[PDB]
Amino acid sequence: KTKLTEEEKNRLNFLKKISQRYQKFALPQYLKTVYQHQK
């Protein structure tokens, strides 16, 4: 295929902010296990 080098870099920025925001607005087990474990 062609014209992928562009669409690629465009995806990177996505996953980058995704795993950054998601892990900063989700914490499904983070604040669930740390709140019980961490004393």
Curated annotation (Swiss-Prot):
Sequence repeats: 1-39
Origin superkingdom: Eukaryota
Protein name, UniProt field: Casocidin-1
Organism: Bos taurus
Residues of the full protein shown: 165 to 203 of 222
